Amino acid sequence: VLTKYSQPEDSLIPFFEITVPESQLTVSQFTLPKSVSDGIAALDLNAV
């Protein structure tokens, strides 16, 4: 996360522009109706 001191073209007011660059977040895969556990209990839905 950066901060730039800028004088915009569209705006006559000088500015400090705090910019958060784009971020890509990796959501891990997961299993579904095969056997589900969330750290509290494990259930075999196929067995059910």
């Binding site: 915009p8 073209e9 569209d10 705006s11 006559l12 007011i13 579904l32 556990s37 750290g39 509290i40 209990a41 494990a42 259930l43 075999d44 067995a47 059910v48």
Partner: protein, 480 residues
């Protein structure tokens, strides 16, 4: 002659139901409870050590204890036995610390002996600081674990009846009509139902044949296959349903084909639905209908077909749904043509980042070759995490009257859109596409709106133009 006998078999097949699936799940829950108990005891110890440090000076060093002493609290519950339920209640001992006030004291207990297992009596071992000494320390390392319940993990029965065959034959005799229908149902362990209806008559319509077989097997899951066929002069019914469960995957298919033989109105329709799920469900939906119409007495005839195809894909990566339909028909009425053809394409897309949906329409139709060109009632929309865009009701229309002096009017909107992005707000709108015509040169219109905002760079343009009869008006407003 009517027969409704039944060779009675009152026996059943009792399939044991495996509750063991729950018996392990509860154990997993207890494991989680035990680790959470460890964590909670850690959190409590964080306070208890400091509390002991605080108390030490007051109690151990200073004379503030061991005066008017009280005997430790120990409560004993004598054992018991219940012959009717066959339960042996072992003695239960509960201890509290007499010093201080009712502070907990260590206790351990086994479980009682019972007949059958609907509930398991909880055996526990609880160790907690005792106030009989100033020393306080929590055994985080000894977590409490209750006995997981085994509620007769394998004592319960799924009932598959052993019923005998159900027989019912109906037979009547007469010179002009003869009916003989037989329905047979087999229920040894699976289901096999067959029907036969036989009708014979001097009259053509009263003579026909109907056959039906339905077969369901349960030994390895429910797998059904139903096929029906009708033999009638005016109706030709073919119906095919088969739901199969191969113990892992799910198959559904509907193949129905039947057509009507009415002279003046001959019809044919056809059904296809095959929902399949190997890993990700896949569904096919194609509906086809045909109709042939002709009314000689009314001198009105029309033919067409309304057919639809839906594609559905619920993939884990993304979800795509595609649908389009075509309402088609042509006909003539009193020597004047009836025109109708409706086409639509509906398209929707979804995803974690972007979703889109654009549906296109063509209402093109006309009566007696009059009032034509119903066109382009379309829209388009897109939404992405980065930006937003929209285009809503751009259209075009032109309808002509074929009576009088051929007055025309096809008023409609022009395209107009919206685009949104960070730091930028842009809105452009063009509208009022009109059709002048006779009777004093009907209105001709149009309107342009431009908005573009960049904070302090704000530019706005507006324009209107109006033309009518022998006069016209144009207005312009600009803000830069």
């Amino acid at each position: 002659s009517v027969k409704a006998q039944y060779k009675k078999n009152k026996h059943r097949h009792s399939i044991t139901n495996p509750l063991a699936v729950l018996c392990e799940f509860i154990s997993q829950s207890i494991k989680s409870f035990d680790r959470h108990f460890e964590k909670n005891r850690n959190n409590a110890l964080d306070f208890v050590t400091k509390s002991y440090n605080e108390t030490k000076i007051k109690f151990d060093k200073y004379k503030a204890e061991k005066s008017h002493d009280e005997l430790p609290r120990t409560f004993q519950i004598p054992g018991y036995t219940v012959p009717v339920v066959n339960v042996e209640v072992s003695p239960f001992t509960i201890e509290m610390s007499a010093f201080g006030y009712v502070f907990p004291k260590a206790v351990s207990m086994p479980s009682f002996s019972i007949l059958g297992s609907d509930v398991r009596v909880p055996s526990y071992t609880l160790i907690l600081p005792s106030l009989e000494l100033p020393v306080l320390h929590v055994p985080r390392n000894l977590k409490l674990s209750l006995p997981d319940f085994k509620e007769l993990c394998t004592i319960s029965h799924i009932f598959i009846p052993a019923m005998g065959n159900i027989t019912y034959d109906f037979s009547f005799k007469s010179s002009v009509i003869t009916l003989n229908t037989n329905a047979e149902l087999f229920n040894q362990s699976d289901i096999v139902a067959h029907l036969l209806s036989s009708s014979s008559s001097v009259i053509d319509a009263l003579q026909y044949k109907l056959e039906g077989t339905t077969r369901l097997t349960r030994k390895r899951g429910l797998k059904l296959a139903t096929a029906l066929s009708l033999s009638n002069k005016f109706v030709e019914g073919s119906h095919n349903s088969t739901v199969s469960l191969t113990t892992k995957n799910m198959e559904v298919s509907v193949a129905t084909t039947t057509k009507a033989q009415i002279p003046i109105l001959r019809m044919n329709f056809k059904q296809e639905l095959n929902g399949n799920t190997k890993s990700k469900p896949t569904v096919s939906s194609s509906m086809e209908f045909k109709y042939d119409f002709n009314s000689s007495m009314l001198y009105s005839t029309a033919k067409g077909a309304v057919d639809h195809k839906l594609s559905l894909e619920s993939l884990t990566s993304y979800f795509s749904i595609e649908s389009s339909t075509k309402g088609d028909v042509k006909g003539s009425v009193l020597s004047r043509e009836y025109s109708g053809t409706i086409a639509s394409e509906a398209n929707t897309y979804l995803n974690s980042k972007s979703t889109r949906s654009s549906v296109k329409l063509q209402g093109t139709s006309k009566i007696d070759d009059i009032w034509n060109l119903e066109v382009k009632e379309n829209f388009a929309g897109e939404a992405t995490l980065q930006r937003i865009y929209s285009l809503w009701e751009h259209s075009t229309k032109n309808h002509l009257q074929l009576e009088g002096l051929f007055f025309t009017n096809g008023e409609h909107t022009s395209k107009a859109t919206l685009e949104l992005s960070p730091w930028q707000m842009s809105a452009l709108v063009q509208v009022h596409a009109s059709q002048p015509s006779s009777f004093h040169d009907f209105p001709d219109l149009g309107q342009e709106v431009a908005l573009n905002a960049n904070t302090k760079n704000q530019k706005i343009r507006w324009k209107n133009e109006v033309r009518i009869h022998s006069g016209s008006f144009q207005s312009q407003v600009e803000l830069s």
